[PDB]
Design a protein around this ligand. Structure first.
Ligand SMILES: Cc1cc2nc3c(=O)[nH]c(=O)nc-3n(C[C@H](O)[C@H](O)[C@H](O)COP(=O)(O)OP(=O)(O)OC[C@H]3O[C@@H](n4cnc5c(N)ncnc54)[C@H](O)[C@@H]3O)c2cc1C
Ligand SMILES: Cc1cc2nc3c(=O)[nH]c(=O)nc-3n(C[C@H](O)[C@H](O)[C@H](O)COP(=O)(O)OP(=O)(O)OC[C@H]3O[C@@H](n4cnc5c(N)ncnc54)[C@H](O)[C@@H]3O)c2cc1C
Lengths: 394, 394
């Protein structure tokens, strides 16, 4: 087969770019390993910064999110004493965030893609990339025994962390940087029970807790836990009792529990490859970098790069030129780092590491006091939470 | 002898409080171990935040510093690329800092104290504190064989890090917190040569460098160096060549060298005792806490506590009451920590630690980019550099 851009990866990155390109007139084919269920059972993110919203806007998840997603103007951060509110809008120069839900923005892209007639080879095992640095790359997947060959012009890796694009890049051509943090996150998606209205972030000595939403009668909760320590060991009841355990007056008559919408899980780290490019391969999303879940970045990360991948593709196709397309990893790496940074700070002011000496934790307490206190303090939080500015081009 | 407040320590803390108290009418006696030379050969600080200036103001080092001290409205921070200016006044809400010089503010207090007739027992060996928790404390020093006894009402420890007040506090009554950083600072006070006009802070990969002033034809330079690595090993010429080595276009035709005004030295760490109190003992300054030299805090630290020590003493003496004097370690510990914090951040964004993985240094670079870039970023720097607000009371 022949298409322009061949996408390995039907997660949201893969879909947006596909679902961006299509609208412009640059035929793409999504190449996905799994079934349209398994990707849809994947319950992750809830927070999308604007720009990834405007992006969705500049395509399609207008209808349903304009319709169904809580737009939020603040967060709260509690830290042994009390709850402290941020007011993102008046701190951020006037921006905010929407809690739509990852698995939803994903079902809409599979929705809208389905009706355009744009190609998507699901259950495609053995994907392989051939001819990267070449003038005509080609991708190869098995749909039987039936080894097929798709010649494209450009291959965009939206494979995710455990993808095959990244590895298919001559290692000496790459530069990794990564921190595997010592604790995972235990999620608990429950729906019957109503939430506590804004996001509550928490620095309790038993570890970190996080009350979140998906709907107005749908909750998303997490509590920091050590590694590989089994979930088969957690419980609804054992969850409800520990979450409760790390909160204030938000936690009792106020909180309502229930059995978990059979969603419960794990893990976190920071990782980044440099460069995000090879010949005609382009990594996007989790293929390229990994940021701790704590600053609601990652999907928001993948949107901002899927953005450059696409505008850079317009000019290639539509204008004449695009070696500008070499300047991609350049634009994207700027933002990935201020974002990686924002992510670790959050990670480390809120989390409880096995180590601290009364200085490190003395330091840890004081920085919260300072940032949650100073207006200059607070605006550094706000500014990064909603999203730093986006990007250059030309 | 009998006096009100007995001060162990003639450094600036000891002198200010003494030299504050006197003016109010609360007789004090300074008790110092060394000679008035050795304390005066002690060349340290150059930067004093306002408030410690206003304090000096509210006593005496008006004349000479109103006269001789460069008032500064900004600093510059360089970090492989270029120099970046801060503009403390327009970032700080309108404040600034004066580079007077520690050893000077010290000679003025010995100046002014000398003419009031206020007591100062120099060369007083064997100082010892007796009766802390008692209703009438007493201090004991040897001026011969001649063991003397000074009964006071209150003993204020302005002894410095290596003093005798702190140790004379029932250890289980105290709580220490400290970080011994892995590098010292090599100072080089030269005077014949003019400076480079504002302060230049530097993050160069060979370690940190610091160009500073004392006069308009007097310089103060430092370069980070590993520990106990001998100064007998440094040189003027070997200094001039390494400083130069960690700078930009500020460093050549621009910099002028010379032999060092025989001033060359070492070391740094963070340390804090909690509480800063015992019965009728009060620690002030380096006796109580130690902050890395890098955010020009320490003397500025000691001023802000010498301040509470003194106002708290007014009300005891002059009003009627002062159990308010129990609430001292309370006021002072607030500020010492936001200041300890500000000090480590500075220490760690500018210094080059033996460790960093391309993430820690990737993180290190990005945070500078972020703070030196963001306006909210910049104002968090400014606000802390000039001095956080001061304090409550009543
Ligand atoms: C607990 C948690 C909470 C988070 N919360 C937030 C939040 O609130 N806000 C926010 O903005 N971000 C959040 N994130 C980030 C978010 O998880 C991701 O950054 C986002 O899903 C990016 O996904 P992705 O496109 O790279 O790929 P993925 O979601 O991994 O999708 C990759 C796709 O590639 C396919 N694939 C894999 N290998 C192959 C192959 N060899 N061939 C073909 N196809 C293949 C997979 O089947 C999958 O469909 C959170 C993360 C976690 C873990
Ligand atoms: C390289 C460097 C640069 C610095 N730069 C700055 C800067 O730019 N700005 C800033 O604000 N701060 C700066 N600081 C901080 C500054 O050094 C101190 O915080 C400040 O001098 C506080 O001094 P202190 O009063 O506690 O005591 P000290 O200076 O130690 O004086 C203590 C006094 O007590 C006496 N004493 C000791 N033991 C006894 C005893 N048993 N009995 C009686 N007397 C005794 C000593 O003889 C001495 O006179 C810097 C520090 C360093 C190391």
């Amino acid at each position: 087969m022949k298409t322009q851009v061949a996408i390995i990866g039907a997660g949201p990155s893969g879909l947006l770019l596909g679902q961006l390109l299509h609208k412009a007139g640059i035929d793409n084919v999504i190449l996905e390993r799994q079934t349209p269920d398994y990707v849809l059972g994947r319950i992750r993110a809830g927070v999308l910064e604007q720009g990834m919203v405007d992006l969705l806007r500049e395509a399609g998840v207008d209808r349903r999110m304009a319709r169904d997603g809580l737009v939020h103007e603040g967060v709260e951060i509690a830290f042994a004493g009390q709850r402290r509110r941020i007011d993102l809008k008046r701190l951020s120069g006037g921006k905010t965030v929407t809690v739509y839900g990852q698995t939803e923005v994903t079902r809409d892209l599979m929705e809208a893609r389905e009706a355009c007639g744009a190609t998507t080879v699901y259950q495609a095992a053995e994907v392989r990339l051939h001819d990267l640095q070449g003038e005509r790359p080609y991708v190869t997947f098995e749909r039987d025994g039936e080894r097929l060959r798709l010649d494209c012009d450009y291959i965009a890796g939206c494979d995710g962390f455990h993808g095959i694009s990244r590895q298919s890049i001559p290692a000496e051509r790459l530069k990794v940087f990564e921190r595997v943090y010592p604790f995972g996150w235990l999620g608990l998606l429950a729906d019957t029970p109503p939430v506590s209205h804004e996001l509550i972030y928490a620095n309790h000595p038993r570890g970190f807790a996080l009350c979140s939403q998906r709907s107005a009668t749908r909750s998303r909760y997490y509590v920091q836990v050590p590694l590989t320590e089994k979930v088969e060991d957690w419980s609804d009841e054992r969850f409800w009792t520990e979450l409760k355990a790390r909160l204030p007056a938000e936690v009792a008559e106020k909180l309502v529990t229930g059995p978990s919408l059979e969603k419960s899980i794990a893990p976190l780290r920071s990782f980044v490859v440099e460069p995000m490019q090879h010949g005609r391969l382009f990594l996007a999303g989790d293929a390229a970098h990994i940021v701790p879940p704590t600053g609601a970045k990652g999907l928001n990360l993948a949107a901002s790069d899927v953005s450059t991948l696409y505008r850079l593709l317009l000019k290639a196709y539509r204008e004449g030129r695009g070696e500008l397309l070499e300047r991609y990893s350049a634009i994207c790496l700027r933002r990935i780092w201020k974002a990686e940074r924002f992510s670790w700070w959050m990670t480390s002011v809120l989390h409880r590491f096995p180590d601290t000496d009364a200085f490190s934790q003395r330091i840890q307490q004081t920085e919260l006091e300072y940032y949650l206190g100073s207006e200059a303090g607070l605006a550094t939080i706000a500014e990064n939470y909603v999203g730093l500015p986006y990007e250059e081009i030309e």
